[PDB]
């Protein structure tokens, strides 16, 4: 009998380019006269609700209604309130979501590691990892683009952020990608992007290639003598 | 005649050995596919992963005519014929299946319908499109299919040139015309042949140990068999699921269970099928 | 046609000599030594100890190898070391396999 | 009321040489009426738990489990459960735990990636990733050592095992050791050890340092003598 409301993380607003404010009802079957609204402090119920769900024997009838707002309004801590009025309870069900307050904004220092030499000796595949660390919030959305066009999400897995041991307020996240080793031998730029609020432009790109990690000079010293 | 005419020798670049890797390839490890949602559970062979396209990778941009386009694929086909048979010469096994599978894989790369996400495949597709002219997607796909169907003769003759530099006097085999069979069914057949050979070996071992003699070495043989079947079951599940999804679109695959499709046509030992039932 | 005099595995030297057969003439035919020695270029000085730095100076005494910590691993033999392992307060020393395909259970 | 049953990892099977099942009950009121015997597949039990603490940092109850089951039973995969006697729960709770049966055994590959040159230009910290590929099942044990003696667990952090992006049943593990930049420049050998059941010797070790991991130059003294030979 609780209407869970999901706050749009930075990954969602980055991937979908717009804002979604949703109200999902849990442990409640489908009844008529559904009344849901998104309201701020002074009050602007100026949006519509679409895609009403259907009953489920687990009683998770969503009754979801997505709200589209400006990007900076959500970042301004408007503290939107979702009030749900239904037949079971005449009193409105007030559940609220807001942008977190007081969180420090420390920009990530993304490091792109080329595949190891032991990767390439077996000639099976190349495992490029994208090391993202130093971000104090945990809103990380990492894509991979080759030659401009983004890669499929199936190739790369972005692990959930985990606490940093040395830095108490910072988190680290790693996103590896598995690609064929001969394609690495051909020579093609693989770019890993990181999306985060604390970045000056919320986008930082690093480029890896066959020639990023190479010995700059060779110091062969051939010494042949016929004496002992 | 059922042979090939005397073909001039062309320059070919060296390729890494197929047996150079100590792990000898991994069937389970798949690197890149077009999509793992609509094409789920399909396994790439080590042969496809080790498919050496070094010859065409050097001159995929300088090429400007279809005569060189045919000639360059002949050069890489000769290299594949040398590489596959030398690998199986040490293994003492017939290399005809590998030769025809490699030819079909190369032809599907020429089509652009090969079940791979190579940019090399995209580069060759763009080069062939600019060779014949640019049209709409379906039109250029059909034109490339027609061009490969017309020009596969020289490529396949080069393959038996590499075959007959070793076999010699014995007659050349027939084409068998499986080019209409797509990539995933051929990978299914290769996987079935490989896993059936390994089941033959492991079943021979477990019989020769357990049936005559519970010895500790026999228990180890049963444990190895259990480990291998546990490793190979998800592969069968994924490949059978893929077969069920792409079931209805050819006549040869109208036989309902995938195991009997493997059994009834070719490239199998008629021994084991790993059915969950 | 070449006689392999010495094939040491660690130095990975191949001491073999060949003679080029001359034409119909008095003998001035060329005698050669087909020695082909391979460097690891990334192995460490103490081949058994993984915690060694990189070795730069490779000393190849050709007369000595015909008949000294050795350079490259051999797939036939095992070069193994012991590494500590901890699950907590206790410390257990476990032998490890430095190279694959050499000490694999066969 | 929080309850968790933690399977013994292969490190607990190998290093401790004893299988210890723990069904921990935490964040609840204290009654001191805990008497739990680990039930086998049949009705009998093997051993009772030990060392129950009646205090918690947040002033609650913290419980632990303890037993000694033979390793052949775990190889058989018999189902085990932990039932509670402690009196806060009106009905005992059962947590069925067992080794999964039918899972594949792929040997992991231990791979070391040196710190990026961009990070080394900062000159404060150097991060090295011990990337493990193709192990099944998920349970993997990883350690970091410097020149043969182990490090504290706080220095290096390892991520939870996750499914492989493209492989069907394989898993990957990613572990990072954060050290100062000057230590990396001195050339100290940093090594990673991974423990898994599918390994040949159950332990495989790899070593990386400044000279090995993406070195800027190749310094080689190629000296030879006595080319005359005998
Ligand atoms: C460095 O090489 C030396 C040989 O010059 C070895 O040291 C001893 O090697 C023997 C035989 O393997 C072992 O039984 C000894 O325990 C080694 N000594 C010590 C102190 O461990 C070894 O190959 C290398 N040394 C080390 C410490 O790894
Ligand atoms: C290269 O080798 C020479 C002598 O062989 C040495 O003097 C020089 O310092 C080496 N280069 C570097 C960068 O150390
Ligand atoms: C490089 O090698 C030469 C000759 O062995 C040596 O004199 C020099 O000190 C070395 N330099 C470094 C940086 O290792």
From Swiss-Prot, chain A:
Changing residue 149 to A: Has no effect on IgM BCR assembly. Residues 1-102 are annotated as: CH3. Residues 103-212 are annotated as: CH4. Changing residue 143 to A: Has no effect on IgM BCR assembly. Residues 8-98, 108-209 form the Ig-like domain. N-glycosylated; important for IgM secretion and its localization at the plasma membrane. The interaction with FCMR is glycan-independent. Disulfide bonds join 23-82, 130-192. Glycans are attached at residues 51, 58. Constant region of immunoglobulin heavy chains. Immunoglobulins, also known as antibodies, are membrane-bound or secreted glycoproteins produced by B lymphocytes. In the recognition phase of humoral immunity, the membrane-bound immunoglobulins serve as receptors which, upon binding of a specific antigen, trigger the clonal expansion and differentiation of B lymphocytes into immunoglobulins-secreting plasma cells. Secreted immunoglobulins mediate the effector phase of humoral immunity, which results in the elimination of bound antigens. The basic structural unit of both sIgM and mIgM molecules consists of two identical heavy chains and two identical light chains; disulfide-linked. N-terminal variable regions of the heavy and light chains form the antigen binding sites, whereas the C-terminal constant regions of the heavy chains interact with immune receptors to mediate effector functions. It is linked to Agammaglobulinemia 1, autosomal recessive: A primary immunodeficiency characterized by profoundly low or absent serum antibodies and low or absent circulating B cells due to an early block of B-cell development. Affected individuals develop severe infections in the first years of life. This is Immunoglobulin heavy constant mu. It comes from Homo sapiens. The chain holds residues 222 to 433 of 474 of the full protein.
From Swiss-Prot, chain C:
Disulfide bonds join 10-70, 78-103. One of its GO terms (cellular component) is secretory IgA immunoglobulin complex. GO terms for molecular function: antigen binding; IgA binding; immunoglobulin receptor binding; protein homodimerization activity; protein-macromolecule adaptor activity. Glycans are attached at residue 46. It is found in: Secreted. GO terms for biological process: adaptive immune response; antibacterial humoral response; glomerular filtration; humoral immune response; immune response; innate immune response; positive regulation of respiratory burst; protein-containing complex assembly. Keywords: Disulfide bond, Glycoprotein, Pyrrolidone carboxylic acid, Secreted, Signal. It comes from the Eukaryota. Part of the secretory IgA (sIgA) complex that consists of two, four or five IgA monomers, and two additional non-Ig polypeptides, namely the JCHAIN and the secretory component (the proteolytic product of PIGR). Part of the secretory IgM (sIgM) complex that consists of five IgM monomers, and two additional non-Ig polypeptides, namely the JCHAIN and the secretory component (the proteolytic product of PIGR). JCHAIN-containing IgM interacts (via CH4 domain) with FCRM (via Ig-like domain). Serves to link two monomer units of either IgM or IgA. In the case of IgM, the J chain-joined dimer is a nucleating unit for the IgM pentamer, and in the case of IgA it induces dimers and/or larger polymers. It also helps to bind these immunoglobulins to secretory component. This is Immunoglobulin J chain. It comes from Homo sapiens (Human). The lineage of its organism: Eukaryota, Metazoa, Chordata, Craniata, Vertebrata. The chain holds residues 26 to 159 of 159 of the full protein.
């Amino acid at each position: 009998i609780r209407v869970f409301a999901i706050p749009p993380s930075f990954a969602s607003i980055f991937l979908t380019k717009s804002t979604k404010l949703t109200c999902l009802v849990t442990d409640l079957t489908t009844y008529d006269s559904v009344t849901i609204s998104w309201t701020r402090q002074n009050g602007e119920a100026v949006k519509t609700h679409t895609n009403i769900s259907e009953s489920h024997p687990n009683a998770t009838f969503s009754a979801v209604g997505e709200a589209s707002i400006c990007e900076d309004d959500w970042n301004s801590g408007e503290r939107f309130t979702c009030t749900v009025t239904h037949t079971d309870l005449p009193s409105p069900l007030k559940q609220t979501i807001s942008r977190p307050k007081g969180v420090a904004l420390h920009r990530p220092d993304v490091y792109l590691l080329p595949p190891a030499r032991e990767q390439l000796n077996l000639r099976e595949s190349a495992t490029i990892t994208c090391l993202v660390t130093g971000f104090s919030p945990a809103d990380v959305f990492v894509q991979w683009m080759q030659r401009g066009q983004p890669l499929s999400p199936e190739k790369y897995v972005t692990s959930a952020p985990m606490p940093e041991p040395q830095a108490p307020g910072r988190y680290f996240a790693h996103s590896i990608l598995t690609v064929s080793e001969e394609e690495w031998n051909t020579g093609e730029t693989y770019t890993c992007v990181v999306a985060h609020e604390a970045l000056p432009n919320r986008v930082t790109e690093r480029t890896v290639d066959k020639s990023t990690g190479k010995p700059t000079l060779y110091n062969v010293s051939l010494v042949m003598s016929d004496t002992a | 005649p059922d042979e090939n005419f005397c073909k001039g020798i062309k320059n070919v670049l060296s390729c890494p050995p197929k047996n150079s890797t100590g792990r000898n390839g991994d069937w389970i490890s798949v690197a890149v596919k077009e999509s793992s949602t609509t094409n789920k559970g399909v396994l790439v062979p080590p042969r496809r992963k080790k498919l050496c396209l070094r010859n065409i990778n050097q001159v995929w941009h300088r090429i400007k005519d279809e005569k060189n386009f045919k000639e360059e694929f002949v050069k890489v086909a000769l290299g594949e014929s040398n590489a596959l048979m030398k690998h199986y010469k040490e293994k003492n096994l017939n290399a005809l299946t590998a030769i025809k599978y490699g030819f079909s894989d190369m032809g599907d790369i020429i089509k652009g319908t090969d079940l791979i996400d190579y940019q090399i495949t995209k580069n060759i597709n763009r080069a062939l499109d600019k060779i014949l002219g640019n049209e709409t997607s379906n039109d250029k796909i059909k034109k490339r299919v027609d061009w490969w169907e017309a020009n596969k003769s020289a490529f396949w003759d080069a393959f038996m040139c590499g075959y007959k530099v070793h076999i010699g006097n014995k007659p050349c085999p027939e084409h068998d015309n499986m080019d209409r069979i797509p990539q995933y069914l051929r990978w299914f057949r290769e996987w079935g042949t490989y896993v059936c050979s390994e089941y033959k070996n492991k079943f021979e071992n477990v019989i020769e140990l357990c049936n005559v003699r519970k010895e500790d070495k026999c228990k180890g043989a049963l444990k190895h068999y259990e480990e291998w079947v546990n490793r190979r079951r998800p592969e069968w599940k994924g490949q059978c699921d893929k077969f069920e999804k792409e079931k209805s679109k050819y006549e040869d695959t109208k036989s309902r269970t995938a195991e009997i499709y493997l059994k009834e046509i070719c490239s199998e030992c008629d021994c084991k099928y790993k059915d969950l039932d | 046609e070449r006689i392999v005099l010495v094939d040491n595995k660690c130095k990975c030297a191949r001491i073999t000599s060949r003679i080029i057969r001359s034409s119909e003439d008095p003998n001035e035919d060329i005698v050669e030594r087909n020695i082909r020695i391979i460097v690891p270029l990334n192995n460490r000085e103490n081949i058994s100890d993984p915690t060694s730095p990189l070795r730069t100076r490779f000393v190849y005494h050709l007369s000595d190898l015909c008949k000294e910590t050795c350079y490259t691993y051999d797939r036939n033999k095992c070069y193994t070391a012991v590494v500590p392992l901890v699950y907590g307060g206790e410390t257990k020393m476990v032998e490890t396999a430095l190279t694959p395909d050499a000490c694999y259970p066969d």
